[PDB]
């Protein structure tokens, strides 16, 4: 699911 | 959301380092959210801080009294009515997941054994059909005014 924690951080 | 507040109310002219002044405003919004909405049974904020203190008190007096303090030992340390500890500790529990598996792993679950107490058992509904029956014959064997008087009540 391209785990949400990463794409906020990005 | 805490960070956005402090940026609106800041003024650089007081010489405060922006770090530790914002850190105040942030940690306020943290605790005020945690305390509010992390509970399924919502409790007032002072209750939570009361509860928090109790966790600290049970620690310091754990090793001091050899075992753990009796439920009436912490009562002296705390300022309040001191029977309220029970009352506190009663509401302090979190509810339990109704779909908690009981043994065998089978689809018998905790909630599946919780019986209904609001029901009206047939054996009583039976007597109700007969309570109507009994009252009627005593009231027909009277005088017609006493029927009309009673029929209205």
């Amino acid at each position: 699911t391209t785990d949400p924690v990463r794409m906020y951080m990005r | 959301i805490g960070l956005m507040k402090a940026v609106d109310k800041f003024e650089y002219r007081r010489g405060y380092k922006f770090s530790t002044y914002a850190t105040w405003w942030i940690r306020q919004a943290i605790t005020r959210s945690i305390a509010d909405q992390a509970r399924t049974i919502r409790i007032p904020v002072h209750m939570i801080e009361t509860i928090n203190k109790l966790n600290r008190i049970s620690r310091q007096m754990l090793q001091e009294m050899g075992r753990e303090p009796t439920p009436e030992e912490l009562a002296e340390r705390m300022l309040m009515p001191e029977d309220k500890i029970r009352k506190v500790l009663k509401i302090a529990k979190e509810p339990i997941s109704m779909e908690t598996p009981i043994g065998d792993d089978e689809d018998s679950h905790l909630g599946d054994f919780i019986e209904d107490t609001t029901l009206e058992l047939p054996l009583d509904s039976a007597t109700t059909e007969s309570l109507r029956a009994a009252t009627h014959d005593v009231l027909a064997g009277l005088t017609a005014r006493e029927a009309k008087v009673l029929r209205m009540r």
């Binding site: - | 956005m4 399924t40 979190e94 509810p95 109704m98 054996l123 039976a126």
Partner: protein
């Protein structure tokens, strides 16, 4: 609902539903605070996620319930199961007027009847007894009748033998494999706590006597009795439906 000891229990949907309610409120606020897009987006992303975990949890990363490792049961999981709809899935819904115990033999029976414990039959047919007791006037009212059988007054046995007579029951044993797994018998009252089973019917049930239990079921309505008598009765099914030969062979 409350439990004993003052602790509560609640559905997992509640943990789910709040978070959707909460995050929705927090977005309404951010629109009036004119928050930067980088924030109001992330909120949307969380709400779009939290809704999805509410409907069918599992096509994402599996949001867990508060402080508890166990996954929370979703709306979809109340329909899904093993397999499909639970209510129609085995088992399968429990059913009133029934019971069970160990079965034993009894060669003295004729084949069209069966041995049902005195003690059991009393508890099973209770609404029938309440009627007949007050119908014939031996009880003034049901509430009196209730107290009579509670007293276990000897008068009731003579009443019981009337109501038992032409009323078949259904006997059923554990894995129902073919249509002969339910068969209908006429009850004969027995002192003892075991069910007495005519030996020739043991073959059809694939019953041994190593401690197997069978269930009883009372046909209530008038229709069900005549249905159970012309279709499900023992003597009507003596041929196996797989291959026309007798199944009531000597064992």
């Amino acid at each position: 609902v409350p439990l004993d000891g003052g602790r509560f229990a609640t559905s997992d949907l509640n943990d789910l539903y709040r978070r959707v309610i909460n995050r929705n409120n927090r977005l309404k606020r951010l629109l009036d605070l004119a928050a930067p897009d980088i924030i109001v987006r992330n909120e949307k992303r969380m709400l779009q996620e939290a809704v999805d975990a509410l409907l069918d949890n599992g096509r994402r990363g599996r949001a867990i319930t508060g402080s508890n490792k166990r996954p929370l049961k979703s709306l979809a999981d109340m329909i899904k199961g093993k397999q499909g709809r639970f209510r129609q899935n085995l088992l399968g819904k429990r059913v009133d007027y029934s019971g069970r115990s160990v079965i034993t033999v009894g060669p003295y029976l004729r084949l069209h009847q069966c041995g049902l414990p005195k003690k059991m039959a009393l508890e099973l047919f209770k609404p029938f007894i309440y009627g007949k007791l007050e119908l014939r006037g031996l009880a003034t009212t049901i509430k009196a009748a209730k107290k009579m059988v509670e007293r276990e007054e000897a008068v009731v046995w003579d009443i019981l033998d009337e109501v038992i007579r032409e009323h078949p029951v259904l006997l059923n044993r554990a894995p129902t494999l073919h249509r002969l797994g339910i068969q209908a018998f006429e009850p004969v009252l027995i002192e003892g706590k075991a069910i007495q089973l005519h030996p020739l019917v043991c073959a059809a049930y694939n019953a041994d006597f190593d401690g197997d239990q069978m269930a009883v079921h009372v046909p209530l309505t008038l229709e069900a009795q005549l249905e159970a008598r012309a279709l499900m009765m023992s003597t009507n099914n003596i041929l196996s439906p797989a291959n026309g030969e007798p199944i009531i062979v000597p064992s």
